[PDB]
Design a binder for this molecule. Structure first.
Ligand SMILES: CC(C)CCC[C@@H](C)[C@H]1CC[C@H]2[C@@H]3CC=C4C[C@@H](OC(=O)CCC(=O)O)CC[C@]4(C)[C@H]3CC[C@]12C
Ligand SMILES: CCCCCCCCCC(=O)N(CCO)C[C@@H](O)[C@@H](O)[C@@H](O)[C@@H](O)CO
Ligand SMILES: CCCCCCCCCC(=O)N(CCO)C[C@@H](O)[C@@H](O)[C@@H](O)[C@@H](O)CO
Ligand SMILES: CC(C)NC[C@H](O)c1ccc(O)c(O)c1
Ligand code: NA
Length: 288
């Protein structure tokens, strides 16, 4: 029994250490590549930097803390840090999906009014966009959490809030539905709708020719970013709505799983950016 625990503990700590490393390595690379390569300092890559920062926070903060939880079987860090950890978790997913929308809108704009785009998109304005995203994201994630709008009346739940070694995010139905809709479902819809317009206007372009194939590989890359993010988080967000209506329909282990799949997504973008010649050559440079 104490052997089964020691085996599991150490093998899990390892897998965990790996995912931390993969996320932090991958995203530092992306930030450095962009930071040190003028060729890669497009306005669009500013949003990528932002998205990589969200993933970076998941790597440095979110995953390590949740790893100690998954490994040791309790929250070691006390109540305040549990709330902060919970916030940083919600913040990141919110910032990611909002930044993806911005990216999709940037691309729709550049593809359908290259001239208006030219005289409306500047570095100074791209920074305002990024900050506004983080501002709205913080607004929507921190305040209700710090202000306890999320808590439940149930005595089983009240037992967990009092237990300083419990860090379970048991929420009332109102918050479950609300935060899901506000932080994920609405920007998910917006992003899809916009990304389908981008696809249309890109296919009503085909009918120099190499200039247009290079742009279309880049577009499809962003496409994959958005698709993969959706697959990594939608199963969690459906299961979240469903629990509000029936806690028996979907097994608990699968609810935990879908959340980790969510965290896993922060590892993926740097791999996907390898489709691009420039990133790949910058990745070889840096790693020496
Ligand atoms: C909480 C949920 C419901 C919000 C989800 C919506 C966001 C994903 C998107 C939809 C459209 C985006 C907005 C579209 C345009 C802008 C203008 C943009 O930058 C500027 O206006 C710079 C102008 C300047 O100051 O000179 C600021 C961000 C903002 C509000 C964007 C921030 C994110 C928005 C609101
Ligand atoms: C952007 C996210 C914002 C979400 C804001 C949700 C705030 C709503 C707060 C809320 O709905 N409750 C108080 C929570 O402080 C009610 C719950 O406590 C509920 O458990 C009880 O009223 C039950 O008795 C239901 O019949
Ligand atoms: C769109 C706003 C509709 C209000 C949202 C409340 C949904 C809550 C439904 C619910 O609590 N149950 C589903 C009832 O089948 C659980 C019952 O099985 C028992 O509590
Ligand atoms: C393990 C818990 C803290 N993970 C929370 C999950 O990432 C989440 C993200 C956004 C939400 O709106 C939400 O309710 C829940
Ligand atoms: Na607790």
């Amino acid at each position: 029994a104490e052997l089964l625990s020691q085996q599991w503990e150490a093998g899990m700590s390892l897998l965990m250490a790996l995912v931390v490393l993969l996320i932090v390595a991958g995203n530092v690379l992306v930030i450095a590549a962009i930071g040190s390569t003028q060729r890669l300092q497009t306005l669009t890559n500013l949003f990528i930097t932002s998205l990589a920062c969200a993933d970076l926070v998941v790597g440095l903060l979110v995953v390590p803390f949740g790893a100690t939880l998954v490994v040791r079987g309790t929250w070691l860090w006390g109540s305040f840090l549990c709330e902060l950890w919970t916030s940083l978790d919600v913040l990141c997913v919110t910032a990611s999906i909002e930044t993806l929308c911005v990216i999709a809108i940037d691309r729709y704009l550049a593809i359908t009014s290259p001239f208006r785009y030219q005289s409306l998109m500047t570095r100074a304005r791209a920074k305002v966009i990024i900050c506004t995203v983080w501002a709205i994201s913080a607004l929507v994630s921190f305040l209700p959490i710090m202000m306890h709008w999320w808590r439940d009346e149930d005595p089983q739940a009240l037992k967990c809030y009092q237990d300083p070694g419990c860090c379970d995010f048991v929420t009332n139905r109102a918050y479950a539905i609300a935060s899901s809709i506000i932080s994920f479902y609405i920007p998910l819809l917006i992003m899809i709708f916009v990304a389908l317009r981008v696809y249309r206007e890109a296919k009503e372009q085909i009918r120099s020719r190499v200039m247009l194939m290079r742009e279309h590989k880049a577009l499809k890359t962003l496409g994959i970013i958005m698709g993969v993010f959706t697959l990594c988080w939608l199963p969690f967000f459906l299961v979240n709505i469903v629990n509000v209506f029936n806690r028996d329909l979907v097994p608990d282990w699968l609810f935990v799983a879908f959340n980790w799949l969510g965290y896993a997504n922060s590892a993926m973008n740097p791999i996907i950016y390898c489709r691009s010649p420039d990133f790949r050559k910058a990745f070889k440079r840096l790693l020496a």
